[PDB]
Amino acid sequence: LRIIWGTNVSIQECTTNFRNFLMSFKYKFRKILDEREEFINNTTDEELYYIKQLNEMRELGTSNLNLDARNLLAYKQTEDLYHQLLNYPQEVISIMDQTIKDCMVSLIVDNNLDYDLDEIETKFYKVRPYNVGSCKGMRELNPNDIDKLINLKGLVLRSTPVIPDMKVAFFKCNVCDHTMAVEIDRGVIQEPARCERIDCNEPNSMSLIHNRCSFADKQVIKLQETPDFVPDGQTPHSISLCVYDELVDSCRAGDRIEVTGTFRSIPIRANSRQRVLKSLYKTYVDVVHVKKVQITDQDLAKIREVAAREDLYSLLARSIAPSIYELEDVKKGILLQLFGGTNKTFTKGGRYRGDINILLCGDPSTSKSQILQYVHKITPRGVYTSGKGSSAVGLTAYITRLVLESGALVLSDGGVCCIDEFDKMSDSTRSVLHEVMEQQTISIAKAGIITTLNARSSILASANPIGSRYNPNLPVTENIDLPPPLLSRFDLVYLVLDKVDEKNDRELAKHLTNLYLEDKPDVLPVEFLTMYISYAKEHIHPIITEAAKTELVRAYVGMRKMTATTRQLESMIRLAEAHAKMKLKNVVELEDVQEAVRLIRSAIKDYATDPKTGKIDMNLVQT
Amino acid sequence: KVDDVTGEKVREAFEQFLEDFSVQSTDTGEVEKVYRAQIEFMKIYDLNTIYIDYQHLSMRENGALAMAISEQYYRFLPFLQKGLRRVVRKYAPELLNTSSPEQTERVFQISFFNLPTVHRIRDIRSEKIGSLLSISGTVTRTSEVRPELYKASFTCDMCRAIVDNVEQSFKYTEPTFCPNPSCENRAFWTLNVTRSRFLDWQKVRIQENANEIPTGSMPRTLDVILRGDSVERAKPGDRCKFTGVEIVVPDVTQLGLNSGVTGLLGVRDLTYKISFLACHVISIGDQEVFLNSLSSDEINELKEMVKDEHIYDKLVRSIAPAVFGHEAVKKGILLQMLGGVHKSTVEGIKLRGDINICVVGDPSTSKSQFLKYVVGFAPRSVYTSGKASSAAGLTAAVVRDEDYTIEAGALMLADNGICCIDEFDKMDISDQVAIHEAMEQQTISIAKAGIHATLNARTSILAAANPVGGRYNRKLSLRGNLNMTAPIMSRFDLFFVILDDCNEKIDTELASHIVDLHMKRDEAIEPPFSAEQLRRYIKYARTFKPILTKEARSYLVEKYKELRKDDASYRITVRQLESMIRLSEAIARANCVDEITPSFIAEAYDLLRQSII
């Protein structure tokens, strides 16, 4: 038999265990390993999971086949093979790739569906085990763990450009015009000492030609250690993850990705020309699988029922921060911002941007930043920042030599942005934010490097009052202390002030004391509400209608009677489109525009605000 | 020596395609052996390059030739050149030679255009190397034309034996053995420039379109090699489509002249750098001469518009169709785009022919929208936001090139055209003073890094700004509302004032216009003239050079006296008179009148008085 070196386990036996997993292993085995028999379905269980997966790979036309170490453990012989893989991940992965190819050929013949066995041979099946082990940081990874299968979660610090890889060397003889191809094993090309052609009779006549040499796609992605894995006292250590073929560019940089792989250690040459290599070995992880960290039909039905409920707007507001008290209007504005307005692009007038930015000002103990962290959790992509920690250059763009790097707002783009101590945030940073928010995109010019980075990020800001506690005598805008251009740029302005009464104090103290009374203590689940916002954006594309247009023109003229920025009217339209997404209405309606204007009026306590100078009586706040 | 049967078949097929393409699309469906007739034309001009549409190859041989070319261009290129040489020897033997000194064989270039698919620089892959491909992108830079050693001739010092036209790899190469069998020399090879043949060489760096990037990320850059006629066939900063074979560049140091191949190099590793070779380059980015450049229908449309007596008002209305109101700003933009005749005194003082304006107004007035429309309309124009910009970098750039060199500035992108400036108030007053320093005198120059360089800096300037306090203050003087140099304000032709109108009718009209725009996209706008037609009219007017009349000069005298009376000081000056002359020339251009008129001078004085406010 053929045995992997040092394992005393046959490579044929590993392939046979993988074949028993691919066929003659029921999905019932994986479901039983998962237990939860009430959750498992008997018919899909009786069907063979890996047989269905190989047939699905044939239907896709792709050689790659996702692998589950849990399913490998579910099958008994495949569990033994998975332990052998944990010992020798690369060898067992090659064995499983060959087994997947052979099982695909056998499955094509068995199903009798049209397919080419030669096409299956040309295809190189891929085994991508996952759930082999608990996710761990790069700092947790060890040289003993090198050459052992593991599943790792990490946030991509950056993704490197695709790196050419010498899949096979090609030798072309300059003396005799001979053509040859030499496979590259272990990353080293093989060169015959004499000419491949005996008639040439020229020693070392063969010459490698790089263009003729076969190249396989390869890439690397820097991966930061997971925030839980990182030590509390120090920033996480980062190790780049090797990737190739379909795994290359599987996940974009700046988004969390879970890549199962085998850790690798390689000697580092003391000098590139010198054969000598330092006793220390550089360490990198080669990913057997790449994964992240879209609405299911049942989730979409649940979102539809929720959106049908009239209580759902306030329900999602409360669901953003279920434990928090008395900031439901700010949470509703944040939920509208998470839904976002629809974006319209035109040849003239540029492109109206649907993304909504929300500014919130609260006196200390407003729980505004607790709600902001709640919004960061609720957002599908979360960016949280402190005003003292915020920098304008970091928010817009950085340069490394000389190539531009994504700003903090650019990384926020594609998700909601959370800002704490927004009053403490620098006015210069806010001035940088003004242009980026007005354009919904960032443009940067600098010596050497000048480029524009997308900044289409919904922005949430939690701000202190300009006074240490919010002053009713102070104007609400002054208490928020936001610059007027940034306030116009923001779609929504939120004002929250504490109101004191004996019964209200009893209620607040009772809430805090109940959370304390538990030793560990209508709201949608936060993940379900993120999915609801995603489904609202996906299946709802609100646009200005006639009724919404009557409401919008009335609101614009009335706010001009009250001065109305044209951007505020666009922000009201975006909030109206956000409300239609919150209601899962395909187009903006008069009720949506009315709710958007009502949400803006309630957010800044404009109804509470006194008619003159914009100041709000404290009793008027919180009605 | 072994020979590729597929290569020889491809050479025969290419010769057959060239000699008997027999498809002529000229004036009718006809047969003229258009490739052979093009060979005859290249013989008439002694040309060395041939351009072939990829669709012609796709039609020829049922696309077998096109398929072979696309699949293995790198392999069949010598065979294609041999077939072209065979067709040349058959039809134009003079073209076969370089064509008194003995004529060497002429180099033959084959260009392929109109490829079915165009890929972004990010779309390129290592697997795509070695195959013909069309790439869409913008040329960030272009290397100087160089004589790449396509063919090398060496002489052996030991026995005086000489080699000729030796092919060279990516690194410089010498003959493996002495051509003389008796001499065993493998060194002492001395090149001869005359006997060796050098092709023109130029590397043009390219990058993906910033608009093409979805997430706004940095566009992927690709090196495009231009050789022969392809050298200087494109310009830096201009979008272009390149067609040719993708290539991989080995490390010259590893050859001896990240992971790397080894064991071939020998022990040394070899890292591969991706690149592109472009067989074909295409750029995707007097009144009588302009009329000839225009098609017959375009000439007829421009003639009708010029014949219209209301052409001036129609163009002013057509400016910024989406924008409602700001008709004075529209008229100023039209006058600036039309421009004025340059003039220089016998004493040597040179006046500026281009119009320059600065706009100050409250936010949410679509001044930035006007800047965007102007940047889109004006050829050779660049738009930028003032706050996120470098003052010196906009005017000029300097960098070291592999030695100190000079890089083109942002102002040069606006040269011979309008320059739009957004967030002008947010921009540095130092940058504003620099613009004033390079506005009337122009002539941007470099004196740093030990290298002195000159720049013409001939452009029109347009600006948008927010007045002090965030809104225009009518009580506040026109000068000082936007802090800028007084001489610069004087040299500026006009200072537009934008103020919000509380009129309910105007509010309802603007609201209805914005709502109709959002509902109906471009259909809501109804400009009197199309953008392309207005651009053609602007080009024709620029070809025209208005001349001052004697009555026009008397009217200008009276108008300057009236402006001085209005000063009765800082607001009006001889610079205001110069602005009046420039606006009169622009008005004569807009009205298509050959000469300046007293009515045109009156309109110029009215615009200046509107700036006075």
DSSP structure string for A77-144: HHHHHHHHHHHSHHHHHHHHHHHHHHHHHHHHHHH--S--HHHHHHS--EEE--SSS----TTT--TT
Could you give the CA distance from residue B238 to residue A248 in angstroms, rounded to a whole number?
32
- Name the pairing type of β-strands B239-250 and B221-227: unpaired
Verify whether the Cβ–Cβ distance A414 to B399 is below 8 Å: no
Verify whether the Cβ–Cβ distance A443 to B388 is below 8 Å: yes
Which one of B205, B211, B264, B377 makes the best mutation probe of the A interface by having the most chain A beta carbons within 10 Å? B264
Which segments of A255-340 does DSSP mark as H helices, in order? 297-308, 312-320, 328-339
Is A602 labeled as ligand-binding? no
Verify whether the Cβ–Cβ distance A188 to B262 is below 8 Å: yes
Provide the sign of the torsion angle of the four alpha carbons A177, A178, A183, A185, taken in this order: negative
Give the DSSP H/E element, type plus range, for residue B52. strand B49-53
Burial zone of B604 (CB within 10 Å; 0-12 exposed, 13-18 middle, 19+ buried)? buried
Q: Residues B229-261, buried b or exposed e (16+ Cβ, 10 A)?
A: bbbebbebeebbbbbbbbbbebbeebeeeebbb
What is the distance in angstroms between the Cα of A521 and the nearest Cα belonging to chain B?
A: 41
Could you give the CA distance from residue A622 to residue A607 in angstroms, rounded to a whole number?
10
Find, among B550, B544, B556, the residue nearest to B600 by Cα.
Answer: B556
Are the beta carbons of A600 and A606 closer than 8 angstroms? Answer: yes
The shortest CB-CB distance from B387 to any of A252, A435, A566 is to A435
**C-alpha Rg value of chain B to the nearest Å:** 31
Residue A320 CB contacts under 8 Å (≥ 6 apart), including other chains: A331, A334, A335, A371, A374, A375, A378, A526, A529
Question: CA neighbours within 13 Å on the CB side: how many for A398?
Answer: 12
Q: Residues B434-445, buried b or exposed e (16+ Cβ, 10 A)?
A: bbbbbbbebebe
The shortest CB-CB distance from A446 to any of B321, B390, B504 is to B390
Verify whether the Cβ–Cβ distance A410 to B515 is below 8 Å: no
| CA A559, chain centre distance (Å) | 39
Q: Which tokens sit at B430?
A: 């130092």
What is the identity of the amino acid at B149? Answer: L
Which segments of A464-545 does DSSP mark as H helices, in order? 476-480, 484-489, 502-517, 526-539
Triad A500, A502, A503: Cα angle to 5° = 105
Q: Which of residues 473-502 of A touch B (CB under 8 A)?
A: 484-485, 488
**Backbone dihedral angles phi then psi of residue A278, each to the nearest 5 degrees:** -65, 145
A 10 A CB-CB count for B448 gives 12
Find, among B461, B407, B409, the residue nearest to B435 by Cα.
Answer: B461
Does B150 lie at the interface with A, CB-CB under 8 angstroms?
no
The strand ranges marked E within A435-593 are: 442-445, 450-453, 458-463, 492-496
Is A362 labeled as ligand-binding? yes
Burial zone of A36 (CB within 10 Å; 0-12 exposed, 13-18 middle, 19+ buried)? exposed
The shortest CB-CB distance from A169 to any of B74, B264, B363 is to B264
DSSP secondary structure letter of residue A399: E
Strand, coil or helix: what is B89?
helix
Residue A368 CB contacts under 8 Å (≥ 6 apart), including other chains: A327, A330, A360, A361, A362, A462, A463, A496
What is the identity of the amino acid at B493? Answer: D
Where do the structural domains in chain B lie, given as residue ranges? 2-93+105-117, 118-146+200-251+271-285, 147-199, 296-613
Could you give the CA distance from residue A64 to residue A247 in angstroms, rounded to a whole number?
9
Is A245 labeled as ligand-binding? no
Residue B563 CB contacts under 8 Å (≥ 6 apart), including other chains: B572, B576, B577, B580, B605, B608, B609, B612
Q: What chain B residue is nearest to A163 in terms of C-alpha separation? A: B258
Are the beta carbons of B52 and B111 closer than 8 angstroms? Answer: yes
Which segments of A140-267 does DSSP mark as H helices, in order? none
What is the identity of the amino acid at B213? Answer: I
Find, among A366, A329, A403, the residue nearest to A600 by Cα.
Answer: A329
Q: What chain B residue is nearest to A205 in terms of C-alpha separation? A: B264
Strand, coil or helix: what is A477?
helix
Could you give the CA distance from residue B41 to residue A480 in angstroms, rounded to a whole number?
76
Provide the sign of the torsion angle of the four alpha carbons B335, B339, B341, B343, taken in this order: positive
DSSP secondary structure letter of residue B248: E
- Name the pairing type of β-strands B109-113 and B49-53: parallel
Could you give the CA distance from residue A545 to residue B331 in angstroms, rounded to a whole number?
35
Instruction: Point out which residues pair with A496 in neighbouring strands.
Output: A362
Provide the sign of the torsion angle of the four alpha carbons B87, B91, B93, B94, taken in this order: negative
Verify whether the Cβ–Cβ distance B369 to A349 is below 8 Å: yes
Does A441 lie at the interface with B, CB-CB under 8 angstroms?
yes
Residue B81 CB contacts under 8 Å (≥ 6 apart), including other chains: B108, B110
First to last CA, chain A: 83
Which one of A345, A348, A436, A565 makes the best mutation probe of the B interface by having the most chain B beta carbons within 10 Å? A348
Q: Report the structure determination method.
A: cryo-EM
Verify whether the Cβ–Cβ distance B507 to A566 is below 8 Å: no
Could you give the CA distance from residue A241 to residue A160 in angstroms, rounded to a whole number?
10
Is A250 labeled as ligand-binding? no
Residues of B with Cβ-Cβ distance to A544 under 8 angstroms: 515, 518-519
- Name the pairing type of β-strands B453-455 and B444-446: antiparallel
Find, among B65, B77, B70, the residue nearest to B117 by Cα.
Answer: B70
Could you give the CA distance from residue A24 to residue A51 in angstroms, rounded to a whole number?
8
* Three-state SS annotation for B190-205: EECCCCCEEEEEEEEE
Are the beta carbons of A431 and B387 closer than 8 angstroms? Answer: yes
Find, among A174, A150, A517, A560, the residue nearest to B174 by Cα.
Answer: A174
DSSP secondary structure letter of residue B388: S
Residue B145 CB contacts under 8 Å (≥ 6 apart), including other chains: B200, B201, B202, B231, B232
Pick the CATH number of B118-146+200-251+271-285 from 3.40.640.10, 1.10.10.10, 3.30.750.210, 2.40.50.140: 2.40.50.140
Burial zone of A184 (CB within 10 Å; 0-12 exposed, 13-18 middle, 19+ buried)? buried
Verify whether the Cβ–Cβ distance B125 to A352 is below 8 Å: no
Q: How many residues does chain A have?
A: 623
The strand ranges marked E within A346-410 are: 351-352, 358-362, 382-386, 397-400, 403-406
The answer as to CATH 3.40.50.300 being correct for domain B2-93+105-117 is no
* Three-state SS annotation for B487-509: HHHHHCCEEEEECCCCCHHHHHH
State the greatest distance between any 2 C-alpha atoms of chain B, in Å, as a whole number.
103
Q: Which of residues 48-77 of A touch B (CB under 8 A)?
A: none
SS3 content of chain A, % helix, strand, coil (to 5): 40, 20, 40
Find, among A198, A19, A210, the residue nearest to A104 by Cα.
Answer: A19
Verify whether the Cβ–Cβ distance B216 to A446 is below 8 Å: no
Could you give the CA distance from residue A336 to residue A602 in angstroms, rounded to a whole number?
13
Strand, coil or helix: what is A450?
strand
* Three-state SS annotation for A133-161: CCCCCCCCCCCCCECCEEEEEEEEEEECC
Find, among A265, A6, A242, the residue nearest to A147 by Cα.
Answer: A265
Are the beta carbons of B239 and B285 closer than 8 angstroms? Answer: yes
State the residue for tokens 């242009």. A435
Could you give the CA distance from residue A65 to residue A127 in angstroms, rounded to a whole number?
6
SS3 content of chain B, % helix, strand, coil (to 5): 40, 20, 40
Could you give the CA distance from residue B370 to residue B376 in angstroms, rounded to a whole number?
10
Question: CA neighbours within 13 Å on the CB side: how many for A352?
Answer: 27
Verify whether the Cβ–Cβ distance B264 to A189 is below 8 Å: yes
A 10 A CB-CB count for A335 gives 31
Verify whether the Cβ–Cβ distance A484 to B262 is below 8 Å: no
Could you give the CA distance from residue A313 to residue A328 in angstroms, rounded to a whole number?
10
Instruction: Point out which residues pair with A278 in neighbouring strands.
Output: A268
Is B117 labeled as ligand-binding? no
Find, among A565, A564, A427, the residue nearest to A489 by Cα.
Answer: A565
CA distances, A373 to each of A235, A331, A457, A460 (Å): 21, 11, 16, 10
| CA A209, chain centre distance (Å) | 41
Residue A349 CB contacts under 8 Å (≥ 6 apart), including other chains: B322, B366, B369, B517
Q: What chain B residue is nearest to A168 in terms of C-alpha separation? A: B261
DSSP secondary structure letter of residue A342: P
DSSP for B212-243, written as a single string: T-SS-PPPPEEEEEEEGGGTTSS-TTSEEEEE
First to last CA, chain B: 87
Give the DSSP H/E element, type plus range, for residue B244. strand B239-250
Burial zone of B403 (CB within 10 Å; 0-12 exposed, 13-18 middle, 19+ buried)? exposed
CATH architecture of B296-613: 3-Layer(aba) Sandwich (3.40)
Which segments of A310-359 does DSSP mark as H helices, in order? 312-320, 328-339
Q: Which resolution, in Å, applies to this structure?
A: 7.4
Which segments of B274-348 does DSSP mark as H helices, in order? 287-293, 296-307, 311-318, 327-338
Rounded to the nearest 10 degrees, what angle do helices A312-320 and A297-308 cross at?
A: 120
Strand, coil or helix: what is A427?
helix
Q: Residues A198-210, buried b or exposed e (16+ Cβ, 10 A)?
A: eebeeeebbbbbb
Q: Which tokens sit at A270?
A: 């003391």
Burial zone of B80 (CB within 10 Å; 0-12 exposed, 13-18 middle, 19+ buried)? buried
Residues of A with Cβ-Cβ distance to B2 under 8 angstroms: 176-179
Q: Which tokens sit at B419?
A: 């320059």
Are the beta carbons of A402 and A453 closer than 8 angstroms? Answer: no
Q: Which tokens sit at B386?
A: 């003032």
Verify whether the Cβ–Cβ distance B261 to A161 is below 8 Å: no
Are the beta carbons of B31 and B23 closer than 8 angstroms? Answer: yes
Residue B496 CB contacts under 8 Å (≥ 6 apart), including other chains: B328, B329, B332, B357, B358, B359, B360, B361, B610, B611
Are the beta carbons of A65 and A100 closer than 8 angstroms? Answer: yes
Are the beta carbons of A78 and A72 closer than 8 angstroms? Answer: yes
**Backbone dihedral angles phi then psi of residue A98, each to the nearest 5 degrees:** -65, -40
Q: Which tokens sit at B573?
A: 């000056």
Are the beta carbons of A504 and A286 closer than 8 angstroms? Answer: no
Q: Residues A474-509, buried b or exposed e (16+ Cβ, 10 A)?
A: bbbbbbbbbbebbbbbbbbbbbbbbeeeeeeeeeee
**Backbone dihedral angles phi then psi of residue A146, each to the nearest 5 degrees:** -60, 145
Residue A622 CB contacts under 8 Å (≥ 6 apart), including other chains: A326, A497, A498, A499, A608
Residues of B with Cβ-Cβ distance to A432 under 8 angstroms: 387-388
Strand, coil or helix: what is A170?
strand
Burial zone of B185 (CB within 10 Å; 0-12 exposed, 13-18 middle, 19+ buried)? middle
